[PDB]
């Protein structure tokens, strides 16, 4: 009875695997064997932002590549100057278990959310002095993992209830709900043009979504354990997944299969964060073994290590102009590098 | 000097922010943060009621505050989360004293596996668990006047023969004490099997009418603090 439908689902899996195999006769490395290696990349902690009491789950850059928001489990959103090390704002949260923070692309707003299932929107550029709460977005049944502003009125929030949700900030009501993953969703990455976003979850699968209706375009399944971080390539035709099987992998949307895996035997801890630089030649991944590794995204070898953190690296970010990378960490310190 | 007047008053702003961050750091370190774990059968909510007497629809975490002797405790019961917990449990690596509550009267091997997985979890090591072997009364009626036995679901209990008890309750029947000790021993076997020194488990025999559960967290907590101070003052 029902086993007929499940067997036909297995046959659909078989045909999908056959198609993905037939569209590949050469790996990324063969096509990019003759490209010049990046050499050794050395990056030094130019600034060090301190002031967070507890571990830092998330940081998000501003679009001006100078402002920076970070969330910490003491329950602070702090906004930094990151040129000078000044604290532009220090917002206290109502729930001190925030897993994510986002900074509006205009620079007007920050959202944090976290283990309270609500995405709180904070208004920075108020005519009034203090940063007050725009609204709370309460429609998720599991902790918020990631949140990204599309604009001042649309934010995509990932959750531990296995669903991503698109919101309308004026109304506070879900414009769309994305409901494909079986394991809870850990990271989120809007496309460069904000027509799509990839989503990595605790089912070891990444899903490409279309944020116009709310249906999954593609599913990418190459990892072994659950996927902790995702990030589109600058192009928008690829993305890198930072997983818990101690690997990073590059998937591309158009071929729709894995391109390379960025792994080395010495690494036996999970990835916590990924980021590309500006040209996508340089994938930066944070690890549980306390130090970010810089990956040549086209050779698949390490070139450079951001080893300066006492605890695990919980977040990463490259500036929109690419001048800097900031790494937060569970030791409660943010470091800017160049 | 080499920065304008705008930069000056910006730095005055950042320093005024440091002043508030320091006041909050003084608030944040004098408070002890307890993660309360447990199952559906465990009297977890009743223990929370016990500290409340001692002290919003889809809320994803709960939070109760109590103080024992001028020390602020801050207990984080988990609310509307899903069944899987290998991610949101990492948020509690730097808490004092996970408070694990189990249903003693029994499902008990499920509690043993929960304890074993909390204990051996990276990012949850270095946290000392405080077992509340709950529902002791129900365990008494289940053993002393019951057909259900611990010999099944746990074959190595027929050959148990209680160790020399220090000072049980006078009303406790030898069999009641034997089972009550076997269950606690069953948990402490996991506790001592892998957590060498950075870990302690503080078992207790608590009931639904137990009005000393707040103090038994204070004493354990005090002792968990003392071990941390011993390692950070280089005294050990």
């Amino acid at each position: 009875e029902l086993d007929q439908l499940r067997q036909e689902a297995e046959q659909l899996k078989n045909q999908i695997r056959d198609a993905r195999k037939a569209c590949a006769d050469a790996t990324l490395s063969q096509i990019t064997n003759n490209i010049d290696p990046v050499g050794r990349i050395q990056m030094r902690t130019r600034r060090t932002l301190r002031g967070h009491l507890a571990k830092i789950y998330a940081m998000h850059w501003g679009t001006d590549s100078r402002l920076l928001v970070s969330a910490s489990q003491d329950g602070k959103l702090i906004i930094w100057d990151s040129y000078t090390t000044n604290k532009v704002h220090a917002i206290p949260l109502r729930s001190s278990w925030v897993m994510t923070c986002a900074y509006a692309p205009s620079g007007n707003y920050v959202a944090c959310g976290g283990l309270d299932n609500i995405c709180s929107i904070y208004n920075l550029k108020t005519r009034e002095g203090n940063v007050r709460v725009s609204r709370e977005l309460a429609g998720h049944t599991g902790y918020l993992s990631c949140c990204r502003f599309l604009d001042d009125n649309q934010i995509v929030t990932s959750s531990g209830d296995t669903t991503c949700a698109l919101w309308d900030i004026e109304t506070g009501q879900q414009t769309t709900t994305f409901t494909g993953h079986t394991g809870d969703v850990m990271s989120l990455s809007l496309a460069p043009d904000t027509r799509l976003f990839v989503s990595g979850a605790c089912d070891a699968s990444a899903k490409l979504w279309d944020v116009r209706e709310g249906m999954c375009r593609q599913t990418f399944t190459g990892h072994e354990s659950d996927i902790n971080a995702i990030c589109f390539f600058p192009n928008g035709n690829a993305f890198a997944t930072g997983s818990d099987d101690a690997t990073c992998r590059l998937f591309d949307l158009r071929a729709d299969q894995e391109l390379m895996t960025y792994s080395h035997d010495n690494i036996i801890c999970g990835i916590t964060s990924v980021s590309f630089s500006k040209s996508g030649r340089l994938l930066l991944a944070g690890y549980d073994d306390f130090n970010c590794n810089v990956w040549d995204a086209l050779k698949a070898d390490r070139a450079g290590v951001l080893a300066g953190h006492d605890n695990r690296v919980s977040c990463l970010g490259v500036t929109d102009d690419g001048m800097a990378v900031a790494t937060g960490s569970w030791d409660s310190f943010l470091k800017i590098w160049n | 000097c080499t920065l304008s007047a705008e930069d000056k008053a910006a730095v005055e702003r950042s320093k005024m922010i440091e002043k508030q961050l320091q006041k909050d750091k003084q608030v944040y370190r004098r408070t002890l943060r307890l993660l309360l774990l447990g199952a559906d059968n465990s009297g977890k909510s009743t223990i929370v009621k016990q500290m409340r007497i001692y002290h919003v629809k889809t809320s994803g975490i709960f939070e109760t505050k109590f103080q024992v002797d001028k020390v602020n405790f801050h207990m984080f019961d988990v609310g509307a989360q899903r069944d899987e917990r290998r991610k949101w449990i990492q948020c509690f690596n730097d808490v004092t004293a996970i408070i694990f509550v189990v249903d003693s009267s029994d499902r008990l091997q499920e509690a043993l596996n929960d304890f074993k997985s909390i204990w051996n979890n990276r990012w949850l090591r270095t946290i000392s668990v405080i077992l509340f072997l709950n529902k002791q009364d129900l365990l008494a009626e289940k053993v002393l006047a019951g057909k259900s036995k611990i010999e099944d679901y746990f074959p190595e209990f027929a050959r148990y023969t209680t160790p020399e008890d220090a000072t049980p309750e006078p009303g406790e029947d030898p069999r009641v004490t034997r089972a009550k000790y076997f269950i606690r021993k069953e948990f402490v076997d996991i506790s001592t099997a892998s957590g060498d020194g950075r870990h302690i488990c503080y078992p207790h025999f608590t009931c639904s009418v137990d009005t000393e559960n707040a103090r038994r967290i204070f004493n354990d907590c005090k002792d968990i603090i003392l071990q941390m101070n011993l390692r950070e003052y280089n005294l050990v």
């Epitope: 001006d64 100078r66 402002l67 100057d81 040129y83 000078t84 000044n86 532009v88 704002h89 620079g107 009034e128 002095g129 203090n130 | 080499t2 920065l3 304008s4 007047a5 705008e6 930069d7 000056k8 008053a9 910006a10 005055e12 702003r13 320093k15 005024m16 002043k19």
Partner: single-chain antibody, 233 residues
Amino acid sequence: VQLVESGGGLVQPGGSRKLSCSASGFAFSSFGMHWVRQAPEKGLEWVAYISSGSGTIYYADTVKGRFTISRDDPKNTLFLQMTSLRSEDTAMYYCVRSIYYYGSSPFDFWGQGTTLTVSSSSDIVMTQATSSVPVTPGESVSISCRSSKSLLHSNGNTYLYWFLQRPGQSPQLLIYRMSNLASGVPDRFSGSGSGTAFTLTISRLEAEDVGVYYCMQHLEYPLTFGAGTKLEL
């Protein structure tokens, strides 16, 4: 979001005057507070300053040590004493707040500050063009100003403001740091510059865009102004 003050009026050339301020509309204790004074048939003059978390209290070079700018974060007031009143310091006082952080817009909203009258130097100079420039609506005016000292710090920004005033109500900020438009200012006002002399461009000069176009520098603390160009219809 109002700033209102008290007192003010006739005073003797040696009388103690307690010129308070009231700010019961915003987050007082996050803002720097200046004072700026308007000489009646003249331009308007910079006065004391008190930063957020009173720790920097600058003063002018003409009143330095006379009237003790203070603060009261609970009561939300800028209490001021004053006793000397050298017969020409009596003018129209303004209470401007300013917040200082990256991207912030200082000198945004000014008070009223009544017009008490007496009954009887290596600063910068902000010189402007002809003080009238009469133009009818629809034409693009380009009134400018001159700075003796180059307003361009090595940061990369020019610390030049632009204000408008009206026959009556207080002034406002149009474009702070010579480019960035203020909040409630129409996109018709604009600004461009080279470092020492440059201008703001308006397009559709309606009945409320008429007034005196003062100007400020913000590199050092004389916080100087100009005589102001009064555009007529």
